[PDB]
Paper text:
We have previously reported that inhibition of vacuolar protein sorting 34 (VPS34), a crucial lipid kinase in the autophagy/endosomal trafficking pathway, decreases tumor growth in several cancer models, increases infiltration of immune cells and sensitizes tumors to anti‐programmed cell death protein 1/programmed cell death 1 ligand 1 therapy by upregulation of C‐C motif chemokine 5 (CCL5) and C‐X‐C motif chemokine 10 (CXCL10) chemokines. The purpose of this study was to investigate the signaling mechanism leading to the VPS34‐dependent chemokine increase. Finally, the VPS34 inhibitor SB02024 sensitized B16‐F10 tumor‐bearing mice to STING agonist treatment and significantly improved mice survival. These results show that VPS34 inhibition augments the cGAS/STING pathway, leading to greater tumor control through immune‐mediated mechanisms.
Numbering used by the authors: 280 to 417, 472 to 871
Write the structure that this text describes.
Amino acid sequence: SMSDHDLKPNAATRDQLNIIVSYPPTKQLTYEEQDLVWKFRYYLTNQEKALTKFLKCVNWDLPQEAKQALELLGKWKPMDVEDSLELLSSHYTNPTVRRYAVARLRQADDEDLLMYLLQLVQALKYENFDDIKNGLEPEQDLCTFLISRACKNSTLANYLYWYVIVECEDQDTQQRDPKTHEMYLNVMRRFSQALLKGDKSVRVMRSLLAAQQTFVDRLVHLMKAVQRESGNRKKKNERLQALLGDNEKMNLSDVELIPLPLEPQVKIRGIIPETATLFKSALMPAQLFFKTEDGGKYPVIFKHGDDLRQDQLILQIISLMDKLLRKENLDLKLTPYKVLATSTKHGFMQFIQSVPVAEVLDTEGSIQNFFRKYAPSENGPNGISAEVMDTYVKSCAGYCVITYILGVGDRHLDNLLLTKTGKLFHIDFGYILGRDPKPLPPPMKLNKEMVEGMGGTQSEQYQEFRKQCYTAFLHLRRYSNLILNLFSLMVDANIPDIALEPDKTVKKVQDKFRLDLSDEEAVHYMQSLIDESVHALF
Ligand SMILES: C[C@@H]1COCCN1C1=CC(=O)N=C(N2CCCC[C@@H]2C(F)(F)F)C1
């Protein structure tokens, strides 16, 4: 009767709690709201979604409140994976809470865990550094949990190795935050130590990590020699090919099967010497074809003297977004090509056969001419195969929405690529979150050429495009908590456009969701965006 156990909100209080619980994870609760959540804490234990709000209400400095908070945490209806990500941010230091996050995160399968791993490696920054160190030879934390899943899953192990090694080689971290640099060095050692206690298969997996590392080391050596060559591009290409061709010297053309770092499920036995060339751009990245196990080939870009990490983040988010859309039965024919940094200054990208829209205009005059040339169909829309046009409309819609949310700038027509199957996709994420090389970038990154490709503002393709934009936008809004919680874990990352304003990064994504609007209003807003953009184009 003086107890809180049985307090029961009326209809009006329930409606106010439902508002508070439905807030996005970034919304700061007022003192009034905090008091209200606390008051009906026992009532809220039936709501998994109320737990993150509850934990934001605890005065941790009051021993009384802290103990009861942890009692309730144990009794709460269990938190979902997407929400556990919030507990791994810099806001939470409480050991029990952080371990609870891991306990709930463990419920994810390996497929989902891989979609979040990049962020989870950043989140080690917010863990107990002493505990990580003390686990070295003289209820899991995050470090123990990741290593434990990696020991049992060679894909996870592969990405854990590379994500952590890049952190280990970050000279910015080393100079600016030596304790954090030291922590990542300890994670690597903890991972090695764990692998060495494993069975024979795990010890072999470990040795194949090492074999990848030395393969990349040798590729770095090769690129230094090529980039230092005095002569023209043809001479550099000859030197690139000769060095690749000399397996005795460089051990790059024929090696024992190792996982491709970029895609570890694909095993490779070296690089084809004679088809390796440099791109005609200032930093001289190479196009390399890998020899795959089944006798096939896998083209990549290997960049040296260039930081891929912003592109790595964005392609990892695009991958996530595509997966979420597919989860809701929407396949918009996207191209989330792989990107993996092997250091702060080099890395791999998956090369997709394609043509820049600039070159399409130059060689064929328009996107539609391109399609009519390569996919003619007498009775298809504007003489184009229906499947191809369908793929074009879908992929256009998908990228329209995704680049809008991510604030992707520098959208010149060499950064929009097209395939002959009709896929359009974006590359080159050097400007994100509203940045652009020229002033006043538009909210939506649509161009005349793209609209004309689908037959103009008077076609049914155009209507299908707008519809697909609406649908994609509503689906991605439904995953706003997940997406925002993932960006929250990136705030301290050495990624240029985040590091400009760490504290405003998440807001810049969140605003694009227009969470303040209902689904009906959201559709209207998106319609209005597309109309305004396209109107301004003509
Ligand atoms: C890898 C992805 C997907 O497959 C197609 C090419 N793509 C590109 C992505 C990217 O960010 N930049 C690219 N270009 C190519 C034009 C010259 C500059 C630059 C690079 F890498 F060569 F330096 C290409």
